[PDB]
Amino acid sequence: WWPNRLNLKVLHQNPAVADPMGAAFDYAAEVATIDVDALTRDIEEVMTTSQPWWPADYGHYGPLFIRMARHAAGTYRIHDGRGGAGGGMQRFPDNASLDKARRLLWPVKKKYGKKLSWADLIVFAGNCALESMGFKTFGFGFGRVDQWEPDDPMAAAVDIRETFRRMAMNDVETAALIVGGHTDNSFLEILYGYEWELTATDLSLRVDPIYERITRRWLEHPEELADEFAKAWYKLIHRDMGPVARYLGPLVPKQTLLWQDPVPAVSHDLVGEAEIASLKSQIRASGLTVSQLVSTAWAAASSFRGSDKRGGANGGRIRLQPQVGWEVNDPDGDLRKVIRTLEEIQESFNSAAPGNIKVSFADLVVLGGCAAIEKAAKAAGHNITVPFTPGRTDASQEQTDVESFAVLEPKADGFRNYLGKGNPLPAEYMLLDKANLLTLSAPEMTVLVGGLRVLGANYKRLPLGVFTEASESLTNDFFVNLLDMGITWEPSPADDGTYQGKDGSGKVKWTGSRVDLVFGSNSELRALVEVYGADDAQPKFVQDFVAAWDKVMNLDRFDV
Amino acid sequence: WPNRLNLKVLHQNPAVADPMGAAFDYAAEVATIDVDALTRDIEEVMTTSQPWWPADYGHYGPLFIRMARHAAGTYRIHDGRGGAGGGMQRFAPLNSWPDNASLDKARRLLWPVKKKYGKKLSWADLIVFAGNCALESMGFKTFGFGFGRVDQWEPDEVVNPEGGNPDPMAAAVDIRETFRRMAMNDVETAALIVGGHTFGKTHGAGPADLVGPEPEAAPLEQMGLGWKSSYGTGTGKDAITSGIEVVWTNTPTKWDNSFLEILYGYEWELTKSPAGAWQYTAKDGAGAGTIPDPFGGPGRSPTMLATDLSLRVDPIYERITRRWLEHPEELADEFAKAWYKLIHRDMGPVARYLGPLVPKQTLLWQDPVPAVSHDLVGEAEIASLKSQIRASGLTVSQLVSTAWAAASSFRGSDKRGGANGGRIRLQPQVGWEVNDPDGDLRKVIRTLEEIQESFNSAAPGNIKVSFADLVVLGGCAAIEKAAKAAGHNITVPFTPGRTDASQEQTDVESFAVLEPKADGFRNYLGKGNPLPAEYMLLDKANLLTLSAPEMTVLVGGLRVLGANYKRLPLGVFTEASESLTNDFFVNLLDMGITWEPSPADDGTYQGKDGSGKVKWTGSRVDLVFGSNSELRALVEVYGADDAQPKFVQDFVAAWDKVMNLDRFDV
Numbered sequence A: 001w002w003p004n005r006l007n008l009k010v011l012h013q014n015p016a017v018a019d020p021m022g023a024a025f026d027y028a029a030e031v032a033t034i035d036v037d038a039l040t041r042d043i044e045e046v047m048t049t050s051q052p053w054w055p056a057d058y059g060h061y062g063p064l065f066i067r068m069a070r071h072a073a074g075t076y077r078i079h080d081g082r083g084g085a086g087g088g089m090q091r092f093p094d095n096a097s098l099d100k101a102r103r104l105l106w107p108v109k110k111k112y113g114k115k116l117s118w119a120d121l122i123v124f125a126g127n128c129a130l131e132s133m134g135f136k137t138f139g140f141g142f143g144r145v146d147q148w149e150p151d152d153p154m155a156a157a158v159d160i161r162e163t164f165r166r167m168a169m170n171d172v173e174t175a176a177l178i179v180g181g182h183t184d185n186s187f188l189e190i191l192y193g194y195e196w197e198l199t200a201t202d203l204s205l206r207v208d209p210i211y212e213r214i215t216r217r218w219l220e221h222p223e224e225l226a227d228e229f230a231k232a233w234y235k236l237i238h239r240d241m242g243p244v245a246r247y248l249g250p251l252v253p254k255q256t257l258l259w260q261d262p263v264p265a266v267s268h269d270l271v272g273e274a275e276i277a278s279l280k281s282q283i284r285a286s287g288l289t290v291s292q293l294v295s296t297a298w299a300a301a302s303s304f305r306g307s308d309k310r311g312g313a314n315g316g317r318i319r320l321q322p323q324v325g326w327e328v329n330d331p332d333g334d335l336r337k338v339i340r341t342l343e344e345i346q347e348s349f350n351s352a353a354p355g356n357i358k359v360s361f362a363d364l365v366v367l368g369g370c371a372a373i374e375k376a377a378k379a380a381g382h383n384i385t386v387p388f389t390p391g392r393t394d395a396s397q398e399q400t401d402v403e404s405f406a407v408l409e410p411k412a413d414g415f416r417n418y419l420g421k422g423n424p425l426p427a428e429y430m431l432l433d434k435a436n437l438l439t440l441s442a443p444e445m446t447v448l449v450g451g452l453r454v455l456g457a458n459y460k461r462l463p464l465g466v467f468t469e470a471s472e473s474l475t476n477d478f479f480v481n482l483l484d485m486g487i488t489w490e491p492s493p494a495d496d497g498t499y500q501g502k503d504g505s506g507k508v509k510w511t512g513s514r515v516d517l518v519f520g521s522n523s524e525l526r527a528l529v530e531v532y533g534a535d536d537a538q539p540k541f542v543q544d545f546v547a548a549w550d551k552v553m554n555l556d557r558f559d560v
Numbered sequence B: 001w002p003n004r005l006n007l008k009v010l011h012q013n014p015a016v017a018d019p020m021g022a023a024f025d026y027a028a029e030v031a032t033i034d035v036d037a038l039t040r041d042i043e044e045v046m047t048t049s050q051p052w053w054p055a056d057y058g059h060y061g062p063l064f065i066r067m068a069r070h071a072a073g074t075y076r077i078h079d080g081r082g083g084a085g086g087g088m089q090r091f092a093p094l095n096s097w098p099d100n101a102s103l104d105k106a107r108r109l110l111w112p113v114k115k116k117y118g119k120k121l122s123w124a125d126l127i128v129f130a131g132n133c134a135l136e137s138m139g140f141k142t143f144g145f146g147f148g149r150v151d152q153w154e155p156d157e158v159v160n161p162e163g164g165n166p167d168p169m170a171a172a173v174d175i176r177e178t179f180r181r182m183a184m185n186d187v188e189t190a191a192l193i194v195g196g197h198t199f200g201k202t203h204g205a206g207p208a209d210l211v212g213p214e215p216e217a218a219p220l221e222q223m224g225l226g227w228k229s230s231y232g233t234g235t236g237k238d239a240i241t242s243g244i245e246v247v248w249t250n251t252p253t254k255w256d257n258s259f260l261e262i263l264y265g266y267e268w269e270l271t272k273s274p275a276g277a278w279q280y281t282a283k284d285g286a287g288a289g290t291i292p293d294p295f296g297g298p299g300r301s302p303t304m305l306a307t308d309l310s311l312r313v314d315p316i317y318e319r320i321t322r323r324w325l326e327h328p329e330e331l332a333d334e335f336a337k338a339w340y341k342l343i344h345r346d347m348g349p350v351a352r353y354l355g356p357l358v359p360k361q362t363l364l365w366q367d368p369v370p371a372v373s374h375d376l377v378g379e380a381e382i383a384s385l386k387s388q389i390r391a392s393g394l395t396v397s398q399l400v401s402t403a404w405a406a407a408s409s410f411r412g413s414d415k416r417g418g419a420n421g422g423r424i425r426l427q428p429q430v431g432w433e434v435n436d437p438d439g440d441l442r443k444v445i446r447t448l449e450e451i452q453e454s455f456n457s458a459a460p461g462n463i464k465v466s467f468a469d470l471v472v473l474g475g476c477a478a479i480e481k482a483a484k485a486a487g488h489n490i491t492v493p494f495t496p497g498r499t500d501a502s503q504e505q506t507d508v509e510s511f512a513v514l515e516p517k518a519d520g521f522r523n524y525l526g527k528g529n530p531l532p533a534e535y536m537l538l539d540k541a542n543l544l545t546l547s548a549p550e551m552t553v554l555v556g557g558l559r560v561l562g563a564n565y566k567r568l569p570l571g572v573f574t575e576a577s578e579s580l581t582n583d584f585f586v587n588l589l590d591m592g593i594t595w596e597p598s599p600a601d602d603g604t605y606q607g608k609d610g611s612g613k614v615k616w617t618g619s620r621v622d623l624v625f626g627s628n629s630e631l632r633a634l635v636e637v638y639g640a641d642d643a644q645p646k647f648v649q650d651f652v653a654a655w656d657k658v659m660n661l662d663r664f665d666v
């Protein structure tokens, strides 16, 4: 009825029923069988032909392909990660010359069909045009699955600065991109000659002192310009593809780059099933409460952005500076103790293991979270075993760009009941956005919140969400107590965001936050809460929470 | 949506937003519950007044009856949507409409019953069951009840008690019109108004301006509720839900003929209610002030709305109303039948009703089909029936058109129509303009009838074939022949079991709304439409419960197959006709052809090639796939080079789904 309401439609965007290929189709296995030589030949023969319905300017569609490649990959926003070359449905201001020219590539996708997506095709056509000009490129990596539903003065210098900084491009990369896309040295020579007749953009490279320094350096040294343009272009097209394990094809370079957030490759033999049991029995008698383990294992695995597929638990970054310094992770609490205890466990295990079986800290954090979940569930009457797939390695400090990780800090985490100052939208909207980023669905988000409440995973262990009298137990008490109409909620006297579900002859119980009551208030979410809050829905809730938790933990596992 | 195609309406209620997950059939769960225990629990929660919403006369019966009526009171025949169905009354604009006031409470009074069962009793079943049980709790034996209303998890895209001027004669026509859109005649409307208003009262009493916002705009401190009254204590003795303060009968917690004896006992004057105004009261000395106060105190006066008084003044209503005032057993009978029709209107055929309370009697408005009285055909006979159909002289265009005409009348909004029943032969559907009788349809019917006679005469025993099966079997045989001509060897699955109804079984009047005003798959842009052709195509596809890939592949198959209306060349982008290929896709995306509106402006376009010749001609439906970005992405999947067998398989799957849409008995 009332507009500006909570939009649950965002959670289930791009379902599996609108996908023509169905659920029996993985793009990786298809594009791994493609022949990039024939693809390059087809792209070139399209490049050197003049379609009658689109006059081929100078008989060479190269620069048009370059423009579409640079325009599909120019909509990447670091603060959110949406958009981008492949991680954003750029299809479905502009002059409409960016999709009518997308029809020029139809004779190429006609041959391949499902073995080559449009997102891969546009970027690869741009790259092949760039290589066909005469320039040589760093490399290319396929694997961009296409979605099926739309989701002169120095003033120009600072405007370009902000516009390119929103794309995670420093000054050298911005200068390289600007000098390249508009190009030999046919640019810097004419630009630095006769001042371009002293009469907008692309001239500020000679005005801004930091830009002018780099440009005048490149004036007599085209080698730096070539290397910097190759690196900047490769960063530009592959910005939102995630870990290096998602790159496919034989054109992917062997080198590893810092902006990809690299993690070391596995060097030892992973843990089997007896060693996993030994670890889960060792860090269940190590003096660590279920709350600490669950909160730590969620802190590492809730820094994942499903748009550009960066973050996650892989790499063991929770032990390193950008992740441990965040307010939400609470360095002033029990994160250092948990990290030190896990390091001690890892050192003890690696020094006494059969053969060359070794466990990594990144793996051990998630294994500890799984062990804590199992212990809590067993302390609730059930007997389960949460699945756990090893194969994580811990990155060192030198491989983590501190500035690049500042955009992953959560301004508001609904699952952990965190809320930082200066938020655009209210508490529930940020929870919805975070759940959408984690590629979660409405039932998965509901069950995950309802479990994390009773597991004591709240920020600073606040009682704002624990709707149960017995913590350290995975039960559906949150739902069955939220739906109870025997308590009358009201805003707290302290005028804060908290509430008060006071009843029982005037007594006050279940002090609740906003992201807690939004589940019982919103009818669409109350439906799911009633599904999980029934009398016989106790084991179904546990199984669903285990499934959601395992899905969240293994979000970043793209190598498997 | 009405200014740009909204493809998200095709994938409404996805499976990823369903908490119960896949492989969960509601029929199995709800068929194994204790109905007696459910009724006992409901009757237990009816008589226990809660302190957060007090009960009038210590009984939640009338509130449950009103909630059940309003849940099933949104059904509309033309679209078919609304009604109980998926229980949209919980999460929709429906929960926040001003005429659904205080019905958000009646869905929380039933929570203690829902939690005791869980997935074994959907909300939609409960909402309409409680009221039904309420009807039995007062002393009125209802017709029956059938569980099985599956529960959805996403909202979809889809009467004045004061007349503005409350003139009973001028409000009777409004009542008749608004009940005509629910397929209720005069006698059923009068029975529903009289019976439903025997139980209960009207709550509105106060300034009527001190009511809070709707639940969709209420603060989270109210926890999903709305209309929080601030006048007085707010709820119970001074609740405000509608504004009018009338108590109809002397015993609003029992069934009796006291509504008629009150309506036809006093003359009525007009007065202003404490909340709002414009209600009728007794005339001579305020009548007799003998009406129970819901929570105790002074007796009220006999009062009626303007809606209720219309039944006395309208000459059509007055005669039957007086007859019921004389004989009450007829009133009870018509009320039972009308209520049963009301709560089960949009539940589909009788094969979907579950539980022990479902009656054994058949009713005309259900469009009954005769029970199977023979052994169905196996696999040896089907392989011979297909050969006989193929060698009967019927071209694939006629067979496909007949099968689609039989099976495209279905609408998933209320699950009526479908290829079952075999009603393409019968009067309401054989004469529709879209099911072109000025052509080769009667010939197809005659050929299928003679094939049926030949097969049944030489029966191998107790195995016989029905015409309803024969239409779909001919469609599948034609598609098999087309695919074999195109080069692929496939076998379209066929599941026999359909039966042929008679002309007395079908109702001609109630099928005037199933007529397709615009069928996107066979162009037929019929006169009198509220939207362009493409939006009507999306509406038709959403009615068939089709997705976007299925709709695209079905359109692209029906074009080249020859299913078009009047066999127009308006959309057949293939050169070799009567063949199942993706030539509608590989030629729609052909960029060497320029599309311009035809000189004879009628909504059709001309596709000229580069040599200045009119190569293809298409319509808005045919050309919307090559222009809309979301749809063009699907066309490029079936329009590729290697995706010929994938296209054929997808088309066969879509055909199977459409044929077996209205098959709930299997």
Ligand code: HEM
Residues within 6 Å of the ligand: B056, B062, B063, B065, B066, B069, B159, B160, B161, B175, B192, B193, B195, B196, B197, B199, B200, B201, B202, B203, B204, B241, B242, B307
């Ligand atoms: C044109 C047709 C009708 C009109 C204009 C009408 C009018 C109304 C109105 C305005 C209310 C609100 C009273 C309140 O909220 O306290 C109401 C309540 C109610 N209606 Fe109707 N009604 C109609 C038909 C029906 C039907 C078809 C049924 C049942 C099948 C029914 C049964 C009830 C009941 C049981 C209540 C509530 C009684 C209570 O809460 O004590 N009415 N009606």
